[PDB]
């Protein structure tokens, strides 16, 4: 440790894109690609967010730009998103695409479908957020997806993303 | 919001260096510069870390490399570090430089001088962490500094860092 943190990768077969997901959603964090919201919203205050694959809501912000989330509007219910940590590929399936106002901070609650809850989450979600409409920032386009598969990396890379090679996740 | 986070800048007059500090201390977070540990260690588990200037321990990891923390060993008690958020320049003064083992996670506790505490911190620290010795990772070089001044940015940039211009913190 010091530091002991890992990063994740995100793959989207539908748009044929993938990124390393950095931590944080500040301007410098997401300048070049998507970032993970380190905290989830609850009525009682902000709490540490789910790590990749874990119960809660792993939420990712990315700019509405060519190399990042321009095409998030193309995702439909059923579509697969894969989140990779050091150990596993986690396959999530899109359950909802919606448009919200920028103050709908509910969408990054541990359970975005029960944001007023104060109990521990039991379901693992992935949430993608970007600016909406295209060439505006009046709103946010939100994609929520639910964990459907956990594949240990020992078993190799899922076929749907096997062509998505790195150039170069843990220290 | 969505996202509503900000980033910070870190200035070190002694070595004449400055960076935008990103969120997170994963390999992708700190590939090109220093990053903020999003969570502080406590005996009862990880808790959200201090934001810039705030009670707790704002801790920053940086590689022991030329453009980042190579020269952290040159810092001495009394030396100034400035942390900038959207509103203020926060001047911390180095109180301790030490070498620890890699698993000394205590150094990122909200009060690194009383890591077993389970109380709310009252003092604002800044901690820098890097690999030690040079060209090794057997140890970590730790600099802890304590908040001595909060200057609203409306008053202009302190003389000691006024020459340290950006090329280009909030969304
Ligand atoms: Cl549009
Ligand atoms: Cl050395
Ligand atoms: Na990224
Ligand atoms: Na980051
Ligand atoms: Na940085």
Q: Residue written as tokens 């594949």?
A: A151
Residue B114 lies in a domain: yes
Cis peptide before B133 (omega within 30 of 0): yes
- CA dist A103 and A154 (Å) reads 41
Residue B40 lies in a domain: yes
* Resolution of this deposited model, Å: 1.8
Nearest CA in chain B to A23: B24
Sign of CA dihedral A30, A35, A40, A45: negative
Contact A38, A28 (CB under 8 A): no
Could you say which of A4, A20, A61 has the minimum Cβ distance to residue B3?
A: A61
Cis peptide before B3 (omega within 30 of 0): yes
- CA dist B16 and B129 (Å) reads 18
Angle in degrees, CA A27, B88, A45, rounded to 5:
65
Q: Which residues pair with A90 in a beta bridge?
A: A83, A150
Residue B2 lies in a domain: no
Contact B94, B112 (CB under 8 A): no
Detail the DSSP E strand segments found in A13-107: 17-23, 35-36, 39-40, 47-48, 56-61, 80-84, 88-100
Q: Residue written as tokens 């919201």?
A: A37
Among this protein's residues, is B144 annotated catalytic?
Answer: no
- CA dist B116 and A143 (Å) reads 41
Residue A30 lies in a domain: yes
Cα distances (angstroms) measured from residue A145 to each of A67, A91, A97: 21, 9, 9
Record the tokens describing residue A5, joined without a space.
Answer: 């943190």
- CA dist A20 and A2 (Å) reads 21
Cα distances (angstroms) measured from residue A72 to each of A63, A75, A96, B3: 10, 6, 12, 16
| Count of domains for chain A | 1
Distance from CA of A13 to the nearest CA of B (A): 22
Residue A171 lies in a domain: no
Instruction: Report the half-sphere exposure of A87 (CA within 13 A, side-chain side).
Output: 5
Q: How many CB pairs below 8 Å do chains A and B form together?
A: 125
Q: Which residues pair with B21 in a beta bridge?
A: B8
Among this protein's residues, is B163 annotated catalytic?
Answer: no
DSSP assignments along B38-101, one per residue: SEE--TT--EEPPPTTSSEEEEEE--SSTTTTGGGGG--TT-EEEEE-SSEEEEEEEEEEEEE-
Residue range of the domain that includes B77: 8-154
**A5:B26 CB<8 A:** yes
Q: Which chain A residues have a beta carbon less than 8 Å from that of B47? A: 48
Residue A168 lies in a domain: no
Q: Which residues pair with A47 in a beta bridge?
A: A40
Residue A89 lies in a domain: yes
**Non-local CB neighbours of B59 within 8 Å, separated by 6+ positions:** B36, B37, B40, B49, B107, B108, B126, B127, B128, B129
Q: Which chain B residues have a beta carbon less than 8 Å from that of A170? A: 26-27
Record the tokens describing residue B148, joined without a space.
Answer: 């001595």
Sign of CA dihedral A69, A73, A74, A76: positive
CATH of the domain at A118: 2.40.260.10
Residue B168 lies in a domain: no
- CA dist B56 and B52 (Å) reads 9
How many residues comprise chain A?
171
């Amino acid at each position: 440790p010091l530091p002991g943190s890992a990063n994740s990768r995100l793959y989207i077969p539908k748009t044929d894109q993938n990124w390393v997901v950095v931590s944080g959603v500040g301007p410098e964090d997401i300048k070049y690609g998507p970032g993970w919201y380190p905290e989830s919203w609850t009525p009682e205050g902000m709490v540490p967010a789910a790590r990749a694959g874990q119960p809660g809501n792993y939420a990712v912000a990315g700019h509405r730009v060519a190399a990042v989330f321009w095409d998030l509007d193309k995702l439909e219910e059923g579509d697969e998103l894969v989140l990779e940590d050091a150990e596993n590929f986690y396959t999530y399936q899109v359950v909802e695409s919606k448009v919200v106002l920028p103050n709908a901070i509910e969408v990054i609650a541990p359970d975005p479908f029960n944001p007023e809850s104060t109990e521990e989450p039991e379901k693992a979600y992935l949430t993608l957020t970007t600016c909406h409409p295209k060439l505006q920032n009046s709103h946010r386009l939100i994609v929520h997806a639910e964990l459907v598969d956990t594949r240990p990396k020992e078993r190799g890379m899922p076929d749907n993303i096997a062509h998505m090679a790195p150039e170069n996740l843990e220290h």
